[PDB]
Write an enzyme that holds these catalytic residues in place. Structure first.
Site, PDB file in Angstrom:
ATOM      1  N   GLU B  65       0.779  -1.235   0.000  1.00  0.00           N
ATOM      2  CA  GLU B  65       0.000   0.000   0.000  1.00  0.00           C
ATOM      3  C   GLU B  65       0.816   1.293   0.000  1.00  0.00           C
ATOM      4  OE1 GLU B  65      -3.646   2.432   2.003  1.00  0.00           O
ATOM      5  OE2 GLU B  65      -2.649   0.962   3.316  1.00  0.00           O
ATOM      6  N   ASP B  66       1.954   1.318   0.684  1.00  0.00           N
ATOM      7  CA  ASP B  66       2.750   2.542   0.731  1.00  0.00           C
ATOM      8  C   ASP B  66       3.939   2.544  -0.221  1.00  0.00           C
ATOM      9  OD1 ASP B  66       1.130   3.563   2.947  1.00  0.00           O
ATOM     10  OD2 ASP B  66       2.269   2.167   4.223  1.00  0.00           O
TER      11      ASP B  66
END
Ligand SMILES: [Mn+2]
Ligand SMILES: [Mn+2]
Lengths: 178, 178
Positions: B65-66
């Site tokens: 996600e990051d």
């Protein structure tokens, strides 16, 4: 069916915490915790090491030396089993920058099988990171001297792990030291 | 008698690498790798989890996600076992930050026992950090709103770990939401 223990995570967490403000001297300025991990990981993955006393020792192979921690914190937290290997791989920061590197070549062979493993990894990982990528404001000459010194230490640590040392030699072959 | 596998180390290393540039929102700007580590350790020490699948998934609960990592990379490197949970805890970043939060509450209780564990610990860690330090450039009202939302999500993740949730509650009643 394997898995790290609660002690190993409390150790990984500790090194991560205790180094939280320390960074590796590269362009990006990547966290220093990466190093210790790369070091502890080298033994696991590459050196196929299955003993936590070494994996945790490696996670802390620079705390009592580059942080404000003490063999006692390690002792009261992870026991003497690892306080021993962490002490066996820690430099006396009361000695001058150079006297410690010169001493690293001497005390090398006298070390223990377990501590030699950590010492080689610490070296290997550092080198891998030194190839091409030069430290912040590092003389191009100084960049070489490290390689010279590194090999001298690595030569008195031989006989430990065929695989780690092998890869080490592959780093000296390319560069042109053997 | 236990030790982390070569995979858990390659995963620890991988988490540490992909996040290398990411930093937490605090005055000190501490490395983000320290967060994912806390989440894995939170399960190991507290919650006493003896399953690497969950442990590694936690170390990787923010990469997909990051960072610039993907499910195929995790799948390719660690398997469906790990890829399945890491997907269960990754909010779809195509949506807007406000929507990604709204869904967390909805799809909360719908998660798997294992994925709830990560989600809970993920929250515990973050919360613990919101009491001490206030995110860089953040109003106190918004700092409060996080606690509210946290509770709404955690309230649907309950039934999972009586220990983690017990501590979660400790952070909620001290504030004044419980
Ligand atoms: Mn080192
Ligand atoms: Mn997180």
């Amino acid at each position: 069916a394997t898995y790290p223990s609660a002690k190993f995570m409390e150790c990984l967490q500790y090194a991560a915490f205790k180094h939280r403000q320390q960074r590796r001297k590269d362009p990006q300025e990547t966290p220093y915790v990466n190093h210790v991990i790369n070091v502890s990981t080298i033994l696991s993955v590459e050196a196929c090491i299955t003993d936590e006393g070494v994996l945790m020792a490696a996670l802390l192979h620079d705390v009592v030396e580059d942080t404000d921690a003490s063999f006692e914190d390690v002792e009261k937290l992870f026991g003497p089993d690892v306080c021993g290997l962490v002490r066996e791989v820690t430099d006396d920061k009361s000695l001058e920058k150079q006297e410690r590197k010169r001493l690293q070549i001497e005390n090398a062979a006298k070390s223990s099988c377990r501590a030699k493993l950590i010492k080689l990894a610490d070296k290997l990982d550092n080198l891998r990171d030194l190839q091409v990528n030069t430290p912040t404001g590092w003389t191009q000459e100084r960049r070489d001297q490290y390689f010279v010194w590194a090999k001298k230490v690595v030569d008195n640590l031989r006989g430990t792990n065929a695989n780690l040392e092998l890869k080490l030699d592959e780093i000296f072959r390319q560069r042109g030291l053997l």
